[PDB]
Design an enzyme around this catalytic site. Sequence first.
Site, PDB file in Angstrom:
ATOM      1  CG  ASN B 165      -2.201   0.941   1.220  1.00  0.00           C
ATOM      2  OD1 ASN B 165      -3.147   0.405   0.540  1.00  0.00           O
ATOM      3  ND2 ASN B 165      -1.955   2.179   1.800  1.00  0.00           N
ATOM      4  CB  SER B 167      -1.738   5.819   2.045  1.00  0.00           C
ATOM      5  OG  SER B 167      -1.029   5.268   3.199  1.00  0.00           O
ATOM      6  CB  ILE B 168      -0.910  11.108   1.774  1.00  0.00           C
ATOM      7  CG1 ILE B 168      -0.448  10.885   0.579  1.00  0.00           C
ATOM      8  CG2 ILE B 168      -0.494  12.252   2.768  1.00  0.00           C
ATOM      9  CD1 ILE B 168      -0.777  12.427  -0.122  1.00  0.00           C
ATOM     10  CD  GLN B 187      -7.745   6.427   5.885  1.00  0.00           C
ATOM     11  OE1 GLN B 187      -8.733   5.768   5.113  1.00  0.00           O
ATOM     12  NE2 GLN B 187      -7.105   7.473   5.609  1.00  0.00           N
ATOM     13  CD  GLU B 230      -2.688   2.276  -2.968  1.00  0.00           C
ATOM     14  OE1 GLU B 230      -1.939   1.220  -2.551  1.00  0.00           O
ATOM     15  OE2 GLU B 230      -3.835   2.343  -2.032  1.00  0.00           O
ATOM     16  CD  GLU B 279      -6.921  17.455  12.799  1.00  0.00           C
ATOM     17  OE1 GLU B 279      -8.136  17.652  12.680  1.00  0.00           O
ATOM     18  OE2 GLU B 279      -6.466  16.851  13.685  1.00  0.00           O
TER      19      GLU B 279
HETATM   20  C1  LIG Z   1      -3.666  14.549   0.219  1.00  0.00           C
HETATM   21  C2  LIG Z   1      -3.586  14.258   1.688  1.00  0.00           C
HETATM   22  C3  LIG Z   1      -4.113  13.094   2.316  1.00  0.00           C
HETATM   23  C4  LIG Z   1      -4.055  12.872   3.617  1.00  0.00           C
HETATM   24  C5  LIG Z   1      -3.748  13.866   4.502  1.00  0.00           C
HETATM   25  C6  LIG Z   1      -2.986  14.859   3.987  1.00  0.00           C
HETATM   26  C7  LIG Z   1      -2.965  15.392   2.750  1.00  0.00           C
HETATM   27  C8  LIG Z   1      -2.401  16.515   2.087  1.00  0.00           C
HETATM   28  C9  LIG Z   1      -2.255  15.805   5.205  1.00  0.00           C
HETATM   29  C10 LIG Z   1      -0.908  14.899   5.591  1.00  0.00           C
HETATM   30  C11 LIG Z   1      -1.695  17.063   4.792  1.00  0.00           C
HETATM   31  C12 LIG Z   1      -3.172  15.882   6.365  1.00  0.00           C
HETATM   32  C13 LIG Z   1      -3.591  14.354   6.929  1.00  0.00           C
HETATM   33  N1  LIG Z   1      -3.509  13.597   5.857  1.00  0.00           N
HETATM   34  C14 LIG Z   1      -4.059  12.176   6.188  1.00  0.00           C
HETATM   35  C15 LIG Z   1      -4.712  11.237   5.552  1.00  0.00           C
HETATM   36  N2  LIG Z   1      -5.192  10.340   5.658  1.00  0.00           N
HETATM   37  C16 LIG Z   1      -4.951   9.762   7.024  1.00  0.00           C
HETATM   38  O1  LIG Z   1      -5.154   8.502   7.444  1.00  0.00           O
HETATM   39  N3  LIG Z   1      -4.193  10.441   7.878  1.00  0.00           N
HETATM   40  C17 LIG Z   1      -3.450  11.724   7.566  1.00  0.00           C
HETATM   41  O2  LIG Z   1      -3.074  12.428   8.414  1.00  0.00           O
HETATM   42  N4  LIG Z   1      -5.270  11.864   4.215  1.00  0.00           N
HETATM   43  C18 LIG Z   1      -5.912  10.937   3.366  1.00  0.00           C
HETATM   44  C19 LIG Z   1      -5.529   9.761   2.829  1.00  0.00           C
HETATM   45  O3  LIG Z   1      -4.326   9.975   1.978  1.00  0.00           O
HETATM   46  C20 LIG Z   1      -6.481   8.867   1.894  1.00  0.00           C
HETATM   47  O4  LIG Z   1      -7.762   8.753   2.836  1.00  0.00           O
HETATM   48  C21 LIG Z   1      -6.246   7.918   1.380  1.00  0.00           C
HETATM   49  O5  LIG Z   1      -7.322   7.200   0.697  1.00  0.00           O
HETATM   50  C22 LIG Z   1      -5.475   6.735   1.987  1.00  0.00           C
HETATM   51  O6  LIG Z   1      -4.925   5.513   1.368  1.00  0.00           O
HETATM   52  P1  LIG Z   1      -5.451   4.241   1.588  1.00  0.00           P
HETATM   53  O7  LIG Z   1      -6.806   4.168   1.098  1.00  0.00           O
HETATM   54  O8  LIG Z   1      -4.531   3.440   0.678  1.00  0.00           O
HETATM   55  O9  LIG Z   1      -5.705   4.007   3.106  1.00  0.00           O
HETATM   56  O1  LIG Z   2      -9.650   7.083  14.954  1.00  0.00           O
HETATM   57  C1  LIG Z   2      -9.060   8.137  15.321  1.00  0.00           C
HETATM   58  O2  LIG Z   2      -8.514   8.079  16.649  1.00  0.00           O
HETATM   59  C2  LIG Z   2      -8.821   9.319  14.488  1.00  0.00           C
HETATM   60  C3  LIG Z   2      -8.611  10.404  14.202  1.00  0.00           C
HETATM   61  C4  LIG Z   2      -8.298  11.433  13.321  1.00  0.00           C
HETATM   62  C5  LIG Z   2      -8.893  11.841  12.248  1.00  0.00           C
HETATM   63  C6  LIG Z   2      -8.437  12.993  11.300  1.00  0.00           C
HETATM   64  C7  LIG Z   2      -7.781  13.855  12.183  1.00  0.00           C
HETATM   65  C8  LIG Z   2      -7.413  13.580  13.523  1.00  0.00           C
HETATM   66  C9  LIG Z   2      -7.761  12.569  14.021  1.00  0.00           C
HETATM   67  O1  LIG Z   3      -4.949  16.126   9.648  1.00  0.00           O
HETATM   68  C1  LIG Z   3      -5.803  16.112   8.956  1.00  0.00           C
HETATM   69  O2  LIG Z   3      -6.064  17.302   8.294  1.00  0.00           O
HETATM   70  C2  LIG Z   3      -6.298  14.752   8.526  1.00  0.00           C
HETATM   71  C3  LIG Z   3      -6.681  13.771   8.197  1.00  0.00           C
HETATM   72  C4  LIG Z   3      -7.309  12.660   7.663  1.00  0.00           C
HETATM   73  C5  LIG Z   3      -7.600  11.403   8.265  1.00  0.00           C
HETATM   74  C6  LIG Z   3      -7.975  10.345   7.568  1.00  0.00           C
HETATM   75  C7  LIG Z   3      -8.627  10.525   6.174  1.00  0.00           C
HETATM   76  C8  LIG Z   3      -8.617  11.887   5.596  1.00  0.00           C
HETATM   77  C9  LIG Z   3      -7.842  12.913   6.313  1.00  0.00           C
HETATM   78  K   LIG Z   4      -4.260   5.067  -1.455  1.00  0.00           K
HETATM   79 MN   LIG Z   5      -4.722   1.780  -0.327  1.00  0.00          MN
END
Ligand SMILES: Cc1cc2c3c(c1C)C(C)(C)CC=[N+]3c1c([nH]c(=O)[nH]c1=O)N2C[C@H](O)[C@H](O)[C@H](O)COP(=O)(O)O
Ligand SMILES: O=C(O)C#Cc1ccccc1
Ligand SMILES: O=C(O)C#Cc1ccccc1
Ligand SMILES: [K+]
Ligand SMILES: [Mn+2]
Lengths: 500, 500
Positions: B165, B167-168, B187, B230, B279
């Site tokens: 996987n 992911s971000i 996730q 991916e 956030e």
């Molecule tokens: C573009 C983008 C996506 C973030 C993201 C950010 C950006 C810029 C940040 C880093 C600036 C702020 C927070 N982010 C988180 C995040 N998902 C998550 O689980 N925790 C995060 O902290 N995401 C969303 C995440 O990438 C999507 O939910 C994907 O579907 C996860 O991939 P997966 O389906 O393979 O689990």
């Molecule tokens: O399940 C969780 O504890 C969580 C979370 C979360 C999601 C987005 C931003 C910050 C905390």
């Molecule tokens: O830090 C945050 O803005 C965040 C987040 C997040 C967590 C799970 C899926 C998408 C965004």
């Molecule tokens: K992904």
């Molecule tokens: Mn995935």
Amino acid sequence: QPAHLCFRSFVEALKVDNDLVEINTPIDPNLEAAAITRRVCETNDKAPLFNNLIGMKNGLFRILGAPGSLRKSSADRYGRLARHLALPPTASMREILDKMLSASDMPPIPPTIVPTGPCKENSLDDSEFDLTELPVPLIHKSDGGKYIQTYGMHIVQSPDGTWTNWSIARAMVHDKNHLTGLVIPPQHIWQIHQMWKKEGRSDVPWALAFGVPPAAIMASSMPIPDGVTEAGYVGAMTGSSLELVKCDTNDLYVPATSEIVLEGTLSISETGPEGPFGEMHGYIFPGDTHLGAKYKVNRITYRNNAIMPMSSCGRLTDETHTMIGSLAAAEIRKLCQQNDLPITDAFAPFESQVTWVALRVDTEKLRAMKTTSEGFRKRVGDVVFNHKAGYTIHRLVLVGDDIDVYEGKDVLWAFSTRCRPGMDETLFEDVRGFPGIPYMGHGNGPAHRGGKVVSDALMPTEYTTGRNWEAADFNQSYPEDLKQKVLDNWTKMGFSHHHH
Amino acid sequence: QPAHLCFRSFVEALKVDNDLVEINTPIDPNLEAAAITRRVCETNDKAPLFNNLIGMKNGLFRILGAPGSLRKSSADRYGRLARHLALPPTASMREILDKMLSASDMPPIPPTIVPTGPCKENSLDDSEFDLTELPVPLIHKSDGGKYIQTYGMHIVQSPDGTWTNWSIARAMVHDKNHLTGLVIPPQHIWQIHQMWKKEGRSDVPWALAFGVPPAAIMASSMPIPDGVTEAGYVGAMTGSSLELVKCDTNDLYVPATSEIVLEGTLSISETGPEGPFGEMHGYIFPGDTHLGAKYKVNRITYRNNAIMPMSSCGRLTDETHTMIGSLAAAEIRKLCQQNDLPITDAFAPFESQVTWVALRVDTEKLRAMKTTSEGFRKRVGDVVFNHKAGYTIHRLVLVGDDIDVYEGKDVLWAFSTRCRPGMDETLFEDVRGFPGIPYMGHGNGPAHRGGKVVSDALMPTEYTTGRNWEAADFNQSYPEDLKQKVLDNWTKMGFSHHHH
Ligand SMILES: Cc1cc2c3c(c1C)C(C)(C)CC=[N+]3c1c([nH]c(=O)[nH]c1=O)N2C[C@H](O)[C@H](O)[C@H](O)COP(=O)(O)O
Ligand SMILES: O=C(O)C#Cc1ccccc1
Ligand SMILES: O=C(O)C#Cc1ccccc1
Ligand SMILES: [K+]
Ligand SMILES: [Mn+2]
Ligand SMILES: Cc1cc2c3c(c1C)C(C)(C)CC=[N+]3c1c([nH]c(=O)[nH]c1=O)N2C[C@H](O)[C@H](O)[C@H](O)COP(=O)(O)O
Ligand SMILES: O=C(O)C#Cc1ccccc1
Ligand SMILES: O=C(O)C#Cc1ccccc1
Ligand SMILES: O=C(O)C#Cc1ccccc1
Ligand SMILES: O=C(O)C#Cc1ccccc1
Ligand SMILES: [K+]
Ligand SMILES: [K+]
Ligand SMILES: [K+]
Ligand SMILES: [Mn+2]
């Protein structure tokens, strides 16, 4: 005469402002004038003045479209409205609404009767006009009639003489000497009509004045309290007694400088087909004719070279948004404060199609109340949704002090991020509903009842100890000296005027 | 190398596009770089490239802000996104989302292993770096750490090797050789971590690659299905196998042209302080530190003159809106169609802070279903809110074919005028909720459950016989020949370019 006190002067003012386009070539009242006006309203362009309207005869009539619509610049966005009120063209919405509310704690200034005025320059009796031969506009292609009345003021008086109401309600031509229109609860024209119908002896003496003093048309569009004569409220607001002349065929009084006056009666017994009409929420339902109230016209008086104002209403932005929404919001602000609720500001977001009002809460005062969301939502909704000033509004959004309710982006941000659907909301089903909203009159439930909600976008600590966040924005997430450095170096670094 | 396949090439592409500002004077990673980027994002300005970052040593590192943010013109609004995908800069959102969904019914194209690449130009072992001495940004003044990781890709693999996987997820520096970050259900990084924790034998082999191929960072931000690697989805989408090199200290593979690579482990047992962070919904709650997952860094490899991409996220508009919202919406569109629901388009309105998705319904297909609002809302909400692709979304808005869901004004109009509060809505309390929304994690109810709604903005006849209105707008309320006349005479009369 001053622009706020004379419609003809207002039209000059718009010219002077470079906020008018005079169209001197022939324009058809069948759709064309309204189409041009509609385009103006959807693009915040200059107001159109149609000086050569196909079908104009013997001075009846020119049309001014978009009299209360928006200007394109942010700095004078509300300038047309400001010009209704003697305010600077750069006036904020808060300033406009405060001007509209100012007379609420002033003694009325009753009107002054004068023997004549410009509205008597020409006259047409019962043998000399035919409303079907005037250049009345067809405003929308599916309308059920030609809506003569979109920006005039209905004048009706209680049977006891004590209350004379001025209000805007739509009306269309029915035949040579009648209109049909909306006369609906809880509106004051309807409340007064019901008094005459209970007395049962005669039709309601009536006048409809078009091209009235701009300050008067603004109060005509505002839900000031029951029993308050708009003329004296406008007098107090402007600091001056309005000059009125008597009608020829009845004992009502009309503004001396009215462009066009219809005199007659509003029936206590007769109805006729009314609508459909392209309405403030953005829709027309073709073929949805209903029966409306019926008006008989006995006389027309008018200014030389009379001008009829027209609202080509529908999708954003026109008078039905800028005036109905904003003026209801103003009254709701006052109503909440008079009920001891800690509301500082109210506005109906355009983005909501003026169906929401956002209420800004003084959260220091809220904290001292030592209450909860559920209790506070219920209190606010009971005050507003049980009152006439809340009629048109189906969603109230409560927001804290960081939100500028006059900025729809910020209201949307708060609503979307601070109000948990369901849990943070109270639904109100046993309140009067506004049938004009499509989900009411053409929806799944009763057209006249319910469908209202208070959505609490206050965060939990706003009720207890205080805001516990900072915005993740440039303003709040960076110190002052850094922010100013950035701004001062912005164009230097390579990145990119208030009036625009 | 092509811009969509190599981040360094992407940066050139932005220059070439006149969409980059290179800042060659010293800029502080403590707040300044992020403040400039925040301003960029709130004004849709050019992306900043900080070539002289205070604290940069031995090539680590330059910063590119706002890599996936909006441009100011309407004609190339999404051009930065288009440049991640080899699409023309004028590509519409529909085109971008369709490109992102295209690999869903294609065979994967698995990656190609190559012996070296630019990401091996420099290396630092366990005795030669200290993450606290790199110029890691403080992005928001109240953040609980320096967030190194806002736009890199985490790489983890199931214990059986079958799923890798990308992911971000955010992460911040904990100490010289550790990060802490979010690893949360549902996730995929969390799902894979739970597989390793159940096996119980070792920490999860991990890599974090920054400055990856742009097409890869887009898929990293998209909820493609469980178990789908991916890299092979990006291969299919682009038509080309991605070139990957092996990590030095583990057997994971990273893009050959990655700007910076961290290699190490994600603990199955240890946690450390994480957050708070400004956030995607626009807030930071200062002092709300929680425990997050803990990563150990064993090695760093990097390109000469390495560039770290950074998202300065918060209030509109940044990558957390353009990518998280839009890509979830894309997946939700597909999911609904695979469940036989008549959805043609989906988009998360920016105005909703990407907490809503508007679903455009093919109402001819709906009519043939012979269903009702209540039944249809329940079906749609059960499909979406029970799936991972619906995680971030708390409100679904169903709209008919006249609404362009990519236009937030039109979604807001439909929601406000066609969905009766309460009656036309179904609340979902027994679904996973998104704690990041303030009304969830800092609200009145459970942070992890409920708070979701389906709002039906379909009108009643859309389920039966067909739309029964026309809009009260210039487009719909006037015939074609009149409209064109108006347009053709617009500037002639006195009223007031696509590219801009
Ligand atoms: C573009 C983008 C996506 C973030 C993201 C950010 C950006 C810029 C940040 C880093 C600036 C702020 C927070 N982010 C988180 C995040 N998902 C998550 O689980 N925790 C995060 O902290 N995401 C969303 C995440 O990438 C999507 O939910 C994907 O579907 C996860 O991939 P997966 O389906 O393979 O689990
Ligand atoms: O399940 C969780 O504890 C969580 C979370 C979360 C999601 C987005 C931003 C910050 C905390
Ligand atoms: O830090 C945050 O803005 C965040 C987040 C997040 C967590 C799970 C899926 C998408 C965004
Ligand atoms: K992904
Ligand atoms: Mn995935
Ligand atoms: C600005 C404005 C206000 C309209 C209006 C219009 C405009 C341009 C139209 C004419 C273009 C479309 C429809 N209008 C109606 C209307 N109120 C109503 O009862 N029926 C209407 O048909 N109103 C709202 C009405 O004027 C306010 O509710 C006042 O508070 C009524 O005055 P009252 O409080 O004295 O009853
Ligand atoms: O014709 C319409 O747009 C209308 C209306 C209305 C009715 C009562 C109060 C406000 C507006
Ligand atoms: O019958 C009523 O009470 C009514 C009404 C109405 C109709 C059109 C627009 C606004 C209100
Ligand atoms: O009597 C009804 O159910 C009705 C109605 C109504 C009134 C005004 C506009 C639309 C519907
Ligand atoms: O356990 C809880 O109630 C909680 C929480 C939570 C998680 C992430 C972000 C905010 C609140
Ligand atoms: K009034
Ligand atoms: K709340
Ligand atoms: K509905
Ligand atoms: Mn009144």
